Amino acid sequence: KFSAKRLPSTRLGTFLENRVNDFLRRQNHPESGEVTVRVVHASDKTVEVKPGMKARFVDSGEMAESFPYRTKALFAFEEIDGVDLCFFGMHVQEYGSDCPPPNQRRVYISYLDSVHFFRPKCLRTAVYHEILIGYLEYVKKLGYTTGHIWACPPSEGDDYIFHCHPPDQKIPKPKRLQEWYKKMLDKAVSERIVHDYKDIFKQATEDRLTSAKELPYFEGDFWPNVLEESIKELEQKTSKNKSSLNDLSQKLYATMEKHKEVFFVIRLIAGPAANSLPPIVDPDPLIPCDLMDGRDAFLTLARDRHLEFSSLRRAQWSTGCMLVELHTQ
Numbered sequence: 001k002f003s004a005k006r007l008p009s010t011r012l013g014t015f016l017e018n019r020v021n022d023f024l025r026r027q028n029h030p031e032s033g034e035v036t037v038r039v040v041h042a043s044d045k046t047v048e049v050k051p052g053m054k055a056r057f058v059d060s061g062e063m064a065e066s067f068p069y070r071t072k073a074l075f076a077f078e079e080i081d082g083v084d085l086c087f088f089g090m091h092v093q094e095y096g097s098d099c100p101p102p103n104q105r106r107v108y109i110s111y112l113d114s115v116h117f118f119r120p121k122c123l124r125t126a127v128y129h130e131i132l133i134g135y136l137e138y139v140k141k142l143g144y145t146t147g148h149i150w151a152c153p154p155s156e157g158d159d160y161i162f163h164c165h166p167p168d169q170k171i172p173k174p175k176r177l178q179e180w181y182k183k184m185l186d187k188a189v190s191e192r193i194v195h196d197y198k199d200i201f202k203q204a205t206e207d208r209l210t211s212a213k214e215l216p217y218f219e220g221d222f223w224p225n226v227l228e229e230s231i232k233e234l235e236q237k238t239s240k241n242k243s244s245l246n247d248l249s250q251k252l253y254a255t256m257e258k259h260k261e262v263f264f265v266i267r268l269i270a271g272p273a274a275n276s277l278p279p280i281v282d283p284d285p286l287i288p289c290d291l292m293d294g295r296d297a298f299l300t301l302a303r304d305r306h307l308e309f310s311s312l313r314r315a316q317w318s319t320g321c322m323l324v325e326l327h328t329q
């Protein structure tokens with residue numbers, strides 16, 4: 001027995017678990033258990049502007065070469081019949097106040113994962129929502145002004161965090177997923193945490209973006225790849241001399257409009273408040289941990305040790321083995 005509670009605490013983990021546990025005590029369903037939330041990885045990294053954008057905007061001195069962020073991995077656990085189950089995982093990128101524009105004071109959710117056995121089932125969505133809303137409230141309080149979600153569904157073919165999901169864990173279709181995020185965000189608005197939210201196209205237009213260098217540039221996100229493909233397309237075109245008598249931006253706006261419902265921009269701090277904030281100071285220390293850096297290490301260790309999250313039983317066993325790995329290391 002190495003319970004989840006034994007892992008080192010953080011201000012972030014504590015704030016999230018308090019919000020969940022408080023919510024659950026309000027509901028007072030007899031099936032629910034205590035929820036533990038632990039940050040198991042935090043390190044400092046940079047996202048590099050890829051070759052095409054570098055040539056056009058970095059090399060000309062118009063855009064930073066890379067953007068510093070803090071990556072965090074965290075997990076939520078539920079005690080079920082006296083035994084911790086890992087049911088939720090999240091990886092985020094946090095761009096602080098010392099980050100050059102356009103990434104300044106922005107959080108991006110890299111990946112969400114879950115193992116759908118939260119007990120009771122009827123509170124499962126609500127709990128997921130409380131974690132996400134809590135995360136937004138927490139980073140708002142530190143002074144992050146904007147959250148960013150890429151709201152596409154996972155593939156059976158490529159596990160985000162947990163190796164081997166339940167065969168009957170249901171992957172949403174795009175429109176259902178988008179509605180899930182809106183319901184979460186609507187609750188956040190009603191709690192006066194999120195001021196408002198927009199699709200990326202409406203957000204860009206209102207900020208009067210005119211150059212791609214002004215678009216937030218996140219590690220592994222859709223938009224850096226779009227820009228690389230667009231730039232390649234543009235530089236492939238030749239044309240002959242004319243007779244006597246912003247393409248990039250136009251392509252960007254076109255692609256943004258086409259895909260707008262997938263990409264959410266979440267305004268946490270609005271209007272004058274946003275202009276005169278103090279520095280962002282994160283009270284939590286770095287947490288080196290090779291196992292929980294990126295995704296491949298933990299997926300590798302689960303593959304190699306035949307751990308699965310495909311049933312409650314197996315998921316509890318994998319939880320236990322994971323926790324024992326996190327202690328020993």
Ligand SMILES: C[C@H](CN[C@H](c1ccccc1)[C@@H]1CNc2cc(-c3cnn(C)c3)cnc2O1)c1ccc(C#N)cc1
Binds near residue numbers: 113166168170
């Ligand atoms: C808060 C949760 C997050 N759930 C994740 C998630 C991330 C991003 C988008 C959706 C889901 C996971 C990601 N991976 C995944 C795999 C499978 C799977 C793989 N093989 N098989 C047979 C099933 C089923 N559900 C998953 O949801 C959550 C749960 C439900 C919704 C909805 N709607 C949203 C978030």
Ligand SMILES: [Cl-]
């Ligand atoms: Cl010709």
